Amino acid sequence: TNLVAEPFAKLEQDFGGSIGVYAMDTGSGATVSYRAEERFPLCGSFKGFLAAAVLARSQQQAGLLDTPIRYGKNALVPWSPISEKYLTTGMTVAELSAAAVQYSDNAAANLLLKELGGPAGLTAFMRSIGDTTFRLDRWELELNSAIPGDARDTSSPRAVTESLQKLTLGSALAAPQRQQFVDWLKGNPTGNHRIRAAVPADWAVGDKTGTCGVYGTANDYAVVWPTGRAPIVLAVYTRAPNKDDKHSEAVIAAAARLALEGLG
Protein backbone atom coordinates (compact mmCIF):
# COMPACT_ATOMS: atom_id res chain seq x y z
CA THR A 1 0.00 0.00 0.00
CA ASN A 2 3.05 2.32 0.34
CA LEU A 3 3.56 2.30 -3.50
CA VAL A 4 -0.19 2.92 -4.01
CA ALA A 5 -0.43 5.72 -1.44
CA GLU A 6 2.74 7.73 -1.97
CA PRO A 7 1.69 9.65 -5.13
CA PHE A 8 -1.60 10.63 -3.44
CA ALA A 9 0.29 11.91 -0.38
CA LYS A 10 2.54 13.97 -2.65
CA LEU A 11 -0.49 15.39 -4.46
CA GLU A 12 -2.33 16.48 -1.31
CA GLN A 13 0.82 18.04 0.15
CA ASP A 14 1.28 20.25 -2.93
CA PHE A 15 -2.48 21.01 -2.81
CA GLY A 16 -2.18 21.97 0.86
CA GLY A 17 -4.99 19.77 2.14
CA SER A 18 -6.40 16.26 2.23
CA ILE A 19 -7.61 14.09 -0.65
CA GLY A 20 -9.77 10.98 -0.31
CA VAL A 21 -10.10 8.45 -3.14
CA TYR A 22 -11.83 5.12 -3.73
CA ALA A 23 -12.10 3.31 -7.07
CA MET A 24 -13.67 -0.07 -7.83
CA ASP A 25 -13.34 -2.23 -10.95
CA THR A 26 -16.79 -3.84 -11.12
CA GLY A 27 -15.59 -6.81 -13.16
CA SER A 28 -12.50 -8.03 -11.27
CA GLY A 29 -13.23 -6.46 -7.87
CA ALA A 30 -9.87 -4.65 -7.82
CA THR A 31 -9.80 -1.41 -5.82
CA VAL A 32 -7.64 1.63 -5.13
CA SER A 33 -7.99 3.38 -1.76
CA TYR A 34 -6.55 6.50 -0.16
CA ARG A 35 -8.15 8.00 2.97
CA ALA A 36 -11.16 6.05 1.71
CA GLU A 37 -12.87 5.76 5.12
CA GLU A 38 -12.34 9.37 6.22
CA ARG A 39 -15.28 11.78 6.16
CA PHE A 40 -15.45 14.64 3.65
CA PRO A 41 -18.24 17.19 3.13
CA LEU A 42 -20.68 16.22 0.39
CA CYS A 43 -21.42 19.74 -0.86
CA GLY A 44 -23.55 19.47 -4.00
CA SER A 45 -22.54 15.88 -4.68
CA PHE A 46 -25.51 14.80 -2.56
CA LYS A 47 -27.78 15.97 -5.40
CA GLY A 48 -27.02 12.86 -7.47
CA PHE A 49 -28.13 10.62 -4.61
CA LEU A 50 -31.17 12.86 -4.16
CA ALA A 51 -32.27 12.20 -7.75
CA ALA A 52 -31.71 8.48 -7.22
CA ALA A 53 -33.88 8.61 -4.06
CA VAL A 54 -36.68 10.25 -6.05
CA LEU A 55 -36.39 7.63 -8.80
CA ALA A 56 -36.49 4.87 -6.20
CA ARG A 57 -39.61 6.35 -4.63
CA SER A 58 -41.26 6.35 -8.07
CA GLN A 59 -40.99 2.54 -7.96
CA GLN A 60 -43.44 2.63 -5.01
CA GLN A 61 -45.59 5.56 -6.20
CA ALA A 62 -46.60 5.40 -9.86
CA GLY A 63 -46.65 8.83 -11.44
CA LEU A 64 -44.44 10.51 -8.82
CA LEU A 65 -42.07 11.79 -11.50
CA ASP A 66 -44.93 13.60 -13.31
CA THR A 67 -46.19 15.34 -10.14
CA PRO A 68 -46.36 19.15 -10.58
CA ILE A 69 -44.55 21.24 -7.96
CA ARG A 70 -45.88 24.81 -8.04
CA TYR A 71 -43.68 26.87 -5.76
CA GLY A 72 -43.42 30.47 -4.61
CA LYS A 73 -40.50 32.94 -4.51
CA ASN A 74 -39.48 31.77 -1.02
CA ALA A 75 -38.40 28.42 -2.47
CA LEU A 76 -35.68 30.19 -4.43
CA VAL A 77 -32.23 30.23 -2.86
CA PRO A 78 -28.85 31.23 -4.35
CA TRP A 79 -27.69 29.27 -7.41
CA SER A 80 -31.07 28.17 -8.77
CA PRO A 81 -30.63 28.92 -12.49
CA ILE A 82 -33.37 26.57 -13.75
CA SER A 83 -36.01 26.83 -11.02
CA GLU A 84 -35.76 30.65 -11.13
CA LYS A 85 -37.11 30.60 -14.70
CA TYR A 86 -40.17 28.42 -14.00
CA LEU A 87 -41.43 30.34 -10.96
CA THR A 88 -44.35 31.53 -13.11
CA THR A 89 -45.44 27.98 -14.10
CA GLY A 90 -44.03 25.27 -11.83
CA MET A 91 -41.89 22.22 -12.54
CA THR A 92 -42.53 18.51 -12.23
CA VAL A 93 -40.58 16.22 -9.92
CA ALA A 94 -38.63 14.74 -12.85
CA GLU A 95 -37.81 18.20 -14.25
CA LEU A 96 -36.53 19.31 -10.83
CA SER A 97 -34.44 16.14 -10.54
CA ALA A 98 -32.77 16.81 -13.90
CA ALA A 99 -32.03 20.38 -12.80
CA ALA A 100 -30.54 19.26 -9.47
CA VAL A 101 -28.20 16.79 -11.20
CA GLN A 102 -27.13 18.70 -14.30
CA TYR A 103 -27.17 22.30 -13.02
CA SER A 104 -26.73 21.65 -9.28
CA ASP A 105 -29.89 23.77 -8.84
CA ASN A 106 -30.26 24.54 -5.12
CA ALA A 107 -33.97 25.39 -5.02
CA ALA A 108 -34.73 22.21 -6.96
CA ALA A 109 -32.67 20.26 -4.42
CA ASN A 110 -34.55 21.78 -1.47
CA LEU A 111 -37.95 21.17 -3.12
CA LEU A 112 -37.07 17.51 -3.67
CA LEU A 113 -35.75 17.19 -0.11
CA LYS A 114 -39.11 18.56 1.10
CA GLU A 115 -40.90 15.87 -0.93
CA LEU A 116 -38.74 13.16 0.72
CA GLY A 117 -39.25 14.42 4.30
CA GLY A 118 -36.21 16.68 4.56
CA PRO A 119 -32.50 15.87 4.87
CA ALA A 120 -33.49 13.00 7.19
CA GLY A 121 -35.52 11.49 4.34
CA LEU A 122 -32.54 11.36 2.01
CA THR A 123 -30.41 9.83 4.78
CA ALA A 124 -33.12 7.19 5.28
CA PHE A 125 -33.02 6.31 1.58
CA MET A 126 -29.25 5.88 1.76
CA ARG A 127 -29.65 3.59 4.78
CA SER A 128 -32.16 1.56 2.74
CA ILE A 129 -29.47 0.65 0.19
CA GLY A 130 -27.03 -0.35 2.93
CA ASP A 131 -25.06 2.90 3.22
CA THR A 132 -24.42 3.53 6.92
CA THR A 133 -21.87 6.34 6.39
CA PHE A 134 -23.78 8.96 4.39
CA ARG A 135 -25.50 11.65 6.42
CA LEU A 136 -27.38 14.73 5.29
CA ASP A 137 -28.33 16.93 8.23
CA ARG A 138 -29.07 20.37 6.76
CA TRP A 139 -30.63 22.02 3.71
CA GLU A 140 -29.17 24.28 1.05
CA LEU A 141 -27.21 26.37 1.60
CA GLU A 142 -26.27 25.67 5.24
CA LEU A 143 -24.99 22.19 4.36
CA ASN A 144 -21.98 23.75 2.54
CA SER A 145 -20.28 25.12 5.68
CA ALA A 146 -17.59 22.39 5.55
CA ILE A 147 -16.22 23.30 9.00
CA PRO A 148 -13.15 21.25 10.06
CA GLY A 149 -14.17 18.43 12.36
CA ASP A 150 -17.92 18.58 11.60
CA ALA A 151 -19.42 15.23 10.55
CA ARG A 152 -22.72 16.78 9.44
CA ASP A 153 -23.40 16.57 5.70
CA THR A 154 -20.52 14.18 5.01
CA SER A 155 -19.75 10.75 3.64
CA SER A 156 -16.61 8.76 2.85
CA PRO A 157 -15.12 8.07 -0.60
CA ARG A 158 -15.67 4.32 -0.16
CA ALA A 159 -19.32 4.70 0.85
CA VAL A 160 -20.00 7.12 -2.03
CA THR A 161 -18.50 4.66 -4.54
CA GLU A 162 -20.32 1.64 -3.10
CA SER A 163 -23.67 3.46 -3.17
CA LEU A 164 -23.07 4.82 -6.67
CA GLN A 165 -22.37 1.25 -7.89
CA LYS A 166 -25.63 -0.04 -6.40
CA LEU A 167 -27.68 2.73 -8.01
CA THR A 168 -26.11 2.82 -11.50
CA LEU A 169 -25.14 -0.83 -12.06
CA GLY A 170 -26.80 -2.90 -9.31
CA SER A 171 -30.38 -3.79 -8.47
CA ALA A 172 -31.52 -0.74 -6.46
CA LEU A 173 -33.22 0.96 -9.42
CA ALA A 174 -35.43 -0.76 -11.98
CA ALA A 175 -34.22 -0.54 -15.58
CA PRO A 176 -36.14 2.62 -16.69
CA GLN A 177 -35.18 4.53 -13.54
CA ARG A 178 -31.60 3.24 -13.73
CA GLN A 179 -31.14 4.41 -17.30
CA GLN A 180 -32.66 7.81 -16.45
CA PHE A 181 -30.18 8.21 -13.58
CA VAL A 182 -27.24 7.14 -15.78
CA ASP A 183 -28.38 9.51 -18.54
CA TRP A 184 -28.57 12.45 -16.11
CA LEU A 185 -25.04 11.72 -14.88
CA LYS A 186 -23.63 11.20 -18.40
CA GLY A 187 -25.16 14.46 -19.62
CA ASN A 188 -23.94 16.47 -16.65
CA PRO A 189 -21.75 19.33 -17.99
CA THR A 190 -20.26 20.64 -14.70
CA GLY A 191 -17.38 18.19 -14.33
CA ASN A 192 -15.31 18.58 -17.49
CA HIS A 193 -12.18 19.53 -15.51
CA ARG A 194 -12.56 16.85 -12.83
CA ILE A 195 -12.77 13.03 -13.25
CA ARG A 196 -13.69 13.44 -16.95
CA ALA A 197 -10.32 15.09 -17.63
CA ALA A 198 -8.54 11.87 -16.55
CA VAL A 199 -10.54 9.57 -18.86
CA PRO A 200 -9.84 8.84 -22.56
CA ALA A 201 -12.34 10.67 -24.76
CA ASP A 202 -13.62 7.40 -26.29
CA TRP A 203 -14.99 6.26 -22.92
CA ALA A 204 -18.35 7.40 -21.55
CA VAL A 205 -18.41 9.07 -18.13
CA GLY A 206 -21.29 10.03 -15.85
CA ASP A 207 -20.50 12.21 -12.87
CA LYS A 208 -21.76 14.59 -10.19
CA THR A 209 -19.65 17.42 -8.76
CA GLY A 210 -19.71 19.32 -5.48
CA THR A 211 -18.07 22.68 -4.65
CA CYS A 212 -18.69 24.01 -1.12
CA GLY A 213 -16.91 27.33 -1.79
CA VAL A 214 -14.89 27.28 1.47
CA TYR A 215 -12.12 25.25 3.11
CA GLY A 216 -10.77 24.04 -0.26
CA THR A 217 -13.65 21.56 -0.23
CA ALA A 218 -14.75 20.09 -3.58
CA ASN A 219 -15.38 16.68 -5.08
CA ASP A 220 -16.59 14.49 -7.93
CA TYR A 221 -17.86 10.93 -8.27
CA ALA A 222 -18.30 9.02 -11.49
CA VAL A 223 -19.02 5.85 -13.39
CA VAL A 224 -16.64 5.19 -16.30
CA TRP A 225 -17.49 2.81 -19.15
CA PRO A 226 -14.28 1.63 -20.86
CA THR A 227 -15.19 0.18 -24.23
CA GLY A 228 -15.85 -3.56 -24.12
CA ARG A 229 -14.77 -3.82 -20.47
CA ALA A 230 -16.46 -3.79 -17.08
CA PRO A 231 -17.30 -0.30 -15.75
CA ILE A 232 -15.36 1.50 -13.04
CA VAL A 233 -16.89 3.47 -10.17
CA LEU A 234 -14.86 6.07 -8.29
CA ALA A 235 -15.02 9.04 -5.93
CA VAL A 236 -12.53 11.86 -5.25
CA TYR A 237 -13.09 14.28 -2.33
CA THR A 238 -10.93 17.16 -1.05
CA ARG A 239 -10.75 19.54 1.90
CA ALA A 240 -8.22 21.99 3.31
CA PRO A 241 -7.59 23.53 6.75
CA ASN A 242 -8.15 27.26 6.08
CA LYS A 243 -11.52 28.85 5.28
CA ASP A 244 -10.08 30.76 2.30
CA ASP A 245 -8.03 27.84 0.91
CA LYS A 246 -8.94 27.40 -2.75
CA HIS A 247 -10.25 24.16 -4.15
CA SER A 248 -8.51 22.73 -7.21
CA GLU A 249 -10.15 20.94 -10.12
CA ALA A 250 -6.66 19.98 -11.35
CA VAL A 251 -5.98 18.11 -8.10
CA ILE A 252 -9.24 16.17 -8.48
CA ALA A 253 -8.38 15.19 -12.07
CA ALA A 254 -4.84 14.18 -11.07
CA ALA A 255 -6.08 12.02 -8.19
CA ALA A 256 -8.68 10.43 -10.48
CA ARG A 257 -5.89 9.56 -12.93
CA LEU A 258 -3.73 8.01 -10.19
CA ALA A 259 -6.66 5.84 -9.11
CA LEU A 260 -7.71 4.76 -12.61
CA GLU A 261 -4.11 3.85 -13.63
CA GLY A 262 -3.61 1.79 -10.41
CA LEU A 263 -6.62 -0.55 -10.85
CA GLY A 264 -5.10 -3.19 -13.11
Ligand SMILES: C[C@@H](O)[C@@H](C(=O)O)[C@H]1CC(SCCNC=N)=C(C(=O)O)N1
Ligand atom coordinates in the same frame (compact mmCIF):
# COMPACT_ATOMS: atom_id res chain seq x y z
C1 LIG B 1 -24.22 25.68 -4.45
C2 LIG B 1 -22.72 25.52 -4.45
O1 LIG B 1 -22.30 25.27 -3.16
C3 LIG B 1 -22.30 24.34 -5.38
C4 LIG B 1 -22.65 22.94 -4.74
O2 LIG B 1 -23.85 22.59 -4.57
O3 LIG B 1 -21.73 22.16 -4.40
C5 LIG B 1 -22.93 24.43 -6.65
C6 LIG B 1 -22.16 25.43 -7.64
C7 LIG B 1 -21.45 24.63 -8.48
S1 LIG B 1 -21.51 25.01 -10.26
C8 LIG B 1 -20.08 24.28 -11.10
C9 LIG B 1 -19.16 25.38 -11.62
N1 LIG B 1 -18.16 24.78 -12.51
C10 LIG B 1 -16.98 25.53 -12.93
N2 LIG B 1 -16.15 24.98 -13.68
C11 LIG B 1 -21.65 23.21 -8.03
C12 LIG B 1 -20.96 21.98 -8.61
O4 LIG B 1 -19.72 21.84 -8.52
O5 LIG B 1 -21.66 21.09 -9.14
N3 LIG B 1 -22.77 23.08 -7.31
